[PDB]
Amino acid sequence: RFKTNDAITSAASIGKDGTIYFGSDKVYAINPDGTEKWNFYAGYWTVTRPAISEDGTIYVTSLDGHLYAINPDGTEKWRFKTEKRIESSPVIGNTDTIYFGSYDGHLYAINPDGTEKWRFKTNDAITSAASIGKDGTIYFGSDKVYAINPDGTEKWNFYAGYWTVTRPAISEDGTIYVTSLDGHLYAINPDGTEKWRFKTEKRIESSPVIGNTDTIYFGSYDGHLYAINPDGTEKWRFKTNDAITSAASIGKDGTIYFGSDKVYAINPDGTEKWNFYAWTVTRPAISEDGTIYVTSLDGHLYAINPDGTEKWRFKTE
Template structure:
C-alpha cells in the first residue's frame, strides 16, 4: 500500500481478454495480511459442482418477487440486479472537473464508498482510492492487471479481483485484509448475495465465499473463462454468462439450475428486469430475454457483438451497446424486444470496435456511456444526443454517478475523468 502516492496523479483541467485453458482441481486460500503474521491455508473440502451434473429440480421460479433495491454506489452496475440505473441526475452538459492519471488502461467501472472515496482498479496492477476532488488517497497492489469493478462491503472493506489468480480484500485505509488465491484470473466484478456472502468468477469457476474470503463452493463451466459479474436473485440464485455460449443459473448451494444456450460467447453480465426477466447480450449479435426458468422469451438481432451489460430504462426498456460494423446504442421494448430507438456512432469496418461501456441511466432517463471512438456520450431518454465529450482513448469502462451527480468514467488512456455540468458562459453551456 502507498498512502497518497503510487502511479496516480492529479491534473487540473478548466480489450482484449486473455484466454487460459485448464483448471486446478484444488481450491485453496492464501491469506497475506500486512506484517509478518501471514498464513497459508489450503482447502480441499470445498465442493466443486460441474455444469450439467447434479442438477437442481424444483417448482417454477417465474413468480418469485423481484428485489426492489435502491441503486447503490458500492456495487457494480448499482446493485445485485445489474440494472445500470441511478437515482441521481447526471450532467445535462459536459465540463471536465478533474483527471486522475494512473498511466495504464482503466477498463473497470469505479465504485464509491459512503464517505465519497472512489475505488478503481487498473492495468497498472493496483487498486486506487481517489478522493471526491480527484486527489489520491492511497494505492494497493493487486500483483497483476485489474480488469473489472471492485465491491465495497458493509464494513467498508473493498474486494477486487485481478489477473494474479486472486481476489483481494483491503481495509478502508488500504491495508490487505485477506487474499484468496484461485485457479484462474478473477476478471469479473464480485457480487454480494442477500445473505452477505460473495459470488465471483475466476477462470472457469463461479465461487461462493464468506466476507472473510473462505470459499464455500465452486461451480465450474466447461473449460473457458467466466468473464461476467453474476446477477443475484432474491432467493440467492446466481446468473452469469460463460464463453461456452451459455447463461447459467446456479442455486445457492452451487448446483446448476439450468443452462440457456446462445449462439456464441457470453462476455456480458446479465441484468434482471423489473418483471423477473433476465436480459443478456452475446457475441451471436443478439440480446436474449430469458425467464427465471431458463426459457427464451425473445431475442433481437442487433448485427454486432453485445458485450457490455445492458441497462434498464426508467420504463423498464432494455438499453444495449452494440459493436461494429454499425456501432450504436439501442433501446428495446422489454415485452417484445422491438427496437424503439437507435443512436449510431461512426461506422467501422471492424467487428471488434463499438460500445463496450455498459450504459448508465439516470433519474431523468438520460443515458451515459463511452465508445471505442474516444468519446463519452449523453443521450436523452428518447435517444437524442444531448452532449458528447472527447477523451484521449477508447472507453471500455462503464460510468458511475457520484452523490453530487458528477459522472466519473475511466478510459484506455489511463485517465479517470470527472464530468460535471458546464458553467454559465462555458462552451456548450445551456
C-alpha cells in the same frame, strides 16, 4: 498468447451529484454539461468501470496494479498495491468492503481504509468482477464459479463450462446467474447445484442483468440481446448487427439499454424503443434524471436524452 491491445476505454458510472466518471489514459470526472470537472492519473491505463461509494469515494483499478481510492475533488485518498495488472472492475459490498480480481490469481477484499482484509487464491488470472448476495457471499467466475464466504474461505464452486469472463447476477430469491464462454446462461442455486442452463451457439462476454419481474437479459455474439424467463425459457430476442460484449442496463420504467453497433433502447416486451448511432460502445449508465451515458472504445463519452437524441459528446484527445 497473442498480440493484445489493452488501451481501450472503460464504461461510465455516475456519482450522486450526477458527475460521470470513466477511465482511459486517465480517470476523467465529467460534469452533467459535458465539461471536464477534473482529471486523475491512475497509472498508465485504466480499462475498468469506477465504483462509487456512498461517501463519494471513487474506486478505480488500474493496469498498473493498484486499486486507487479517489476523493470527490480528484485527490488520492489512498492506493492499494498488487504486483500485477487489474482488468477486474471493483465492486463494493457487505459493509463498505471493496472486491476485485487480480492477474496474480487472487480475489482481493479491501477495507475502506486501504488495507487488505483478505485474499482468496486461484490458479489463473481473474479478469471479471464479483457480485455479493444478501447473506454477504461473494461470487465471481474464472476457471469455475466460486462462492466465497465473507471471511474469505471457499463456500463452494461450480463448473459452468471451460471459462467465464462475466459478472454474476443475483436474484431476489437467491439464484445466481452466470453467462459462460461456452454459450450457456447458468442458473445456480445458493447451495452450488445447477437450477437450469439456457443455450446459445456462441460465446457470451455480456454479464447478465435482472429486471422486469425477474427476467434475465444478456447480450450474445450471435448479435442478439436475449431476455430469459426465470424458468430458463427464452422470452424474446432482439437482433443487432454486431456482437454484444457488455451488460445491459435497466431504466426506472424497465427499458433495457445496451450497446453493440448502436446504442439501443428496448421495451420490456422486446420491441425497439429507439437506437442511436455513436467504434463499439460500452455498458450504458443511466442517471436519476434519465440521461443515458455511454463511452466508445476510442475515448468518447456520449450523453443521450431519454428520447434517444444526443445531448453532448466529450472527447479524451
